[PDB]
Amino acid sequence: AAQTNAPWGLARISSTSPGTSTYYYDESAGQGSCVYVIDTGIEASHPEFEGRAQMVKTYYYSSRDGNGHGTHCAGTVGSRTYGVAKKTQLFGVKVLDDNGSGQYSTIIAGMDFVASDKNNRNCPKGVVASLSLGGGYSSSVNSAAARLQSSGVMVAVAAGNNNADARNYSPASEPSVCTVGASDRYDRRSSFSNYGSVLDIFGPGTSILSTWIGGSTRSISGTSMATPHVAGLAAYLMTLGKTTAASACRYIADTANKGDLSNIPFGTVNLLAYNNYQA
Ligand SMILES: [Ca+2]
């Protein structure tokens, strides 16, 4: 399949080189997989999700997204226009309030919820979670991310936007989940992106157009935008039978565009997520 005039990030993820604007992907499109977005929730009624999004959990007075952030991420994973996996099922877990904040304890409870809740969902092709959130190092938070992963969910988490070493951040510093840095459309590291030996991969994170609340769209930036590219790419590859939750991050790093990014600090990976689709 070919989506012309795609958002740049989508075109990039299916290209060996920057500067193109068509997104190419197998038409299976992540059908039969599931992605959890653990964030400020999802405006499920957005036309762009076409019935494939649902809220399954909130820790606050409402499950609606009063912020927009989680809706944006969700649209990058799986909306028809702005998403990588255009046919995946989307599950929203609201651990952050409408100011985009959440206590560590709620975030942890949210991760354990998904690790049980995937047993209540239909996802023959596999299960992914996109965690675009971040805070100072906590072994409790890391540990929660490690359980989510070990239960059989491909876990992808934002490196963080501090332009610093991600070792000091959770769940970014957890070794067993996929930590995701942000790149821009000229193949440079995003200026806010964290870096470090703990990163596994880079996705598109600067000027990323996707869904927003009130049924609209906007462009915004962050490792939180890059993360759903990788989360959607895993779901897509899993429905293709190419990989599993347990080895997805590894597979994505093996098949990445290598050595193509600029401003990558010595000792951080120079890997850019890539779907290897032969159209
Ligand atoms: Ca990691």
Swiss-Prot record:
It catalyses: Hydrolysis of keratin, and of other proteins with subtilisin-like specificity. Hydrolyzes peptide amides. Binds 2 calcium ions per subunit. GO terms for cellular component: extracellular region. Residues 7-279 form the Peptidase S8 domain. It is an enzyme of class 3 (hydrolase). Ca(2+) 2 binds at T16, D260. Ca(2+) 1 binds at P175, V177, D200. The active site is at D39, H69, S224. Its EC number is 3.4.21.64. Keywords: Calcium, Disulfide bond, Hydrolase, Metal-binding, Protease, Serine protease, Signal, Zymogen. One of its GO terms (molecular function) is metal ion binding. GO terms for biological process: proteolysis. Its cofactor is Ca(2+). Disulfide bonds join C34-C123, C178-C249. Belongs to the peptidase S8 family. Hydrolyzes keratin at aromatic and hydrophobic residues. This is Proteinase K. The chain holds residues 106 to 384 of 384 of the full protein.
